[PDB]
Scaffold this motif. Structure first.
Motif, short mmCIF file in Angstrom:
data_model
loop_
_atom_site.label_atom_id
_atom_site.label_comp_id
_atom_site.label_asym_id
_atom_site.label_seq_id
_atom_site.Cartn_x
_atom_site.Cartn_y
_atom_site.Cartn_z
N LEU A 79 0.83 -1.20 0.00
CA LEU A 79 0.00 0.00 0.00
C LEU A 79 0.87 1.26 0.00
CD1 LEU A 79 -3.31 -0.49 0.62
CD2 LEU A 79 -2.79 1.34 2.24
N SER A 81 3.52 1.79 -1.45
CA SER A 81 3.97 2.07 -2.81
C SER A 81 2.99 2.99 -3.53
CB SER A 81 4.12 0.76 -3.59
OG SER A 81 4.23 1.00 -4.98
N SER A 82 1.74 2.99 -3.06
CA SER A 82 0.70 3.83 -3.67
C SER A 82 0.26 4.92 -2.70
CB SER A 82 -0.50 2.97 -4.07
OG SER A 82 -0.34 1.63 -3.63
N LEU A 85 3.39 8.70 2.20
CA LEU A 85 4.48 8.61 3.16
C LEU A 85 5.22 9.94 3.26
CD1 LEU A 85 7.58 7.09 1.49
CD2 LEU A 85 5.38 7.07 0.29
N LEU B 29 11.81 2.19 6.09
CA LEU B 29 10.79 1.47 5.35
C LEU B 29 10.12 2.38 4.32
CD1 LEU B 29 9.21 -1.14 7.65
CD2 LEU B 29 11.56 -0.67 6.95
N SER B 30 9.83 3.61 4.72
CA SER B 30 9.19 4.58 3.83
C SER B 30 10.06 4.85 2.61
CB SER B 30 8.92 5.88 4.58
OG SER B 30 10.06 6.72 4.57
N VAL B 33 10.09 1.50 0.40
CA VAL B 33 8.86 1.28 -0.35
C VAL B 33 8.38 2.57 -1.02
CG1 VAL B 33 6.61 0.15 -0.28
CG2 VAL B 33 8.29 -0.29 1.53
N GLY B 34 8.09 2.48 -2.31
CA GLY B 34 7.63 3.65 -3.04
C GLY B 34 7.20 3.31 -4.46
N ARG B 35 8.04 3.68 -5.43
CA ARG B 35 7.74 3.41 -6.83
C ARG B 35 8.47 2.16 -7.31
NH1 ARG B 35 12.46 3.37 -10.43
NH2 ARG B 35 12.86 5.53 -11.07
N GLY B 37 8.44 -0.59 -5.44
CA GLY B 37 7.84 -1.69 -4.71
C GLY B 37 8.32 -1.77 -3.27
N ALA B 87 -4.76 3.48 -2.89
CA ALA B 87 -4.65 2.38 -3.84
C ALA B 87 -4.34 1.07 -3.11
CB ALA B 87 -3.57 2.67 -4.87
N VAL B 88 -3.94 0.06 -3.87
CA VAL B 88 -3.62 -1.25 -3.30
C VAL B 88 -2.56 -1.96 -4.13
CG1 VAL B 88 -5.51 -2.31 -4.58
CG2 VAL B 88 -4.51 -3.49 -2.61
N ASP B 89 -2.69 -1.87 -5.45
CA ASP B 89 -1.74 -2.51 -6.36
C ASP B 89 -1.56 -3.98 -6.01
OD1 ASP B 89 -1.15 0.39 -5.76
OD2 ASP B 89 0.04 0.16 -7.59
N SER B 92 1.41 -6.03 -7.50
CA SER B 92 2.76 -5.98 -6.94
C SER B 92 2.88 -6.87 -5.71
CB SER B 92 3.13 -4.54 -6.57
OG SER B 92 2.03 -3.67 -6.76
N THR B 96 6.00 -7.65 -3.12
CA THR B 96 5.95 -7.31 -1.71
C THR B 96 6.12 -8.55 -0.83
OG1 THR B 96 4.21 -5.76 -2.41
CG2 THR B 96 4.77 -5.80 -0.06
#
Lengths: 109, 109
Positions: A79, A81-82, A85, B29-30, B33-35, B37, B87-89, B92, B96
């Motif tokens: 989540l 990723s979308s 943050l 972590l932030s 995780v981003g673009r 994954g 979102a949720v994606d 991916s 994850t």
């Protein structure tokens, strides 16, 4: 519960069954966490479903307890990723850490 | 490792030492995780510090392995409160779930 057997198990995390369980969490966790910090009801609600599935997926009743913890992370990580943050509410840490503790001990214990 | 003793331990989640550790992860972590994954390097990097700290915080070498799982979630859950989660994606998920498995076993296992 060695993380090696659980991570290599047929119902671990890299498994297809785990991805499906996480999908539901990606929606529950997102709805649980927001302006209220986190909803234990929705958070623990997901673990209860995962634990039950894992408990009868082919693993042990002890591994599912630790495996679920990882399944809940995948839903959040994916989540992010979308997400945005763009802030860290370190002042609510006690609330978040306290929620997970009660949620985990409420659904798994 | 029951979630009752670990959560009641002096180094569980409600503990002050656990909140500080999560803070560092909330940033790592932030950034992981981003673009892309998720960055196992940054993800596992935070767990390695937590597992080591917990492994000598006063608990057992087995409890820290399961306790860290919760500490990693708190960092994300708390961050979500300041995120967008728009979102949720589910596409991916494979990445994850695969990252968490490799990261968890990379720092813990």
């Amino acid at each position: 519960p060695s993380f090696g057997l659980v991570l290599n198990s047929p119902n671990g995390l890299r498994s297809p069954q785990a991805k499906a369980r996480i999908n539901n969490l990606a929606s529950a966790l997102s709805t649980a966490v927001g302006r209220n910090g986190v909803d234990v009801n929705a958070f623990t609600s997901g673990l209860r479903a995962t634990l039950s599935n894992l408990g009868d997926s082919g693993m042990s009743p002890n591994e599912a307890k630790v495996e679920v913890l990882l399944e809940a992370l995948t839903a959040a990580l994916q989540l992010l990723s979308s997400s945005t943050l763009g802030a860290v509410d370190t002042t609510s840490i006690g609330l978040t850490s306290n929620s997970v503790s009660k949620a985990v001990a409420q659904a798994l214990a």
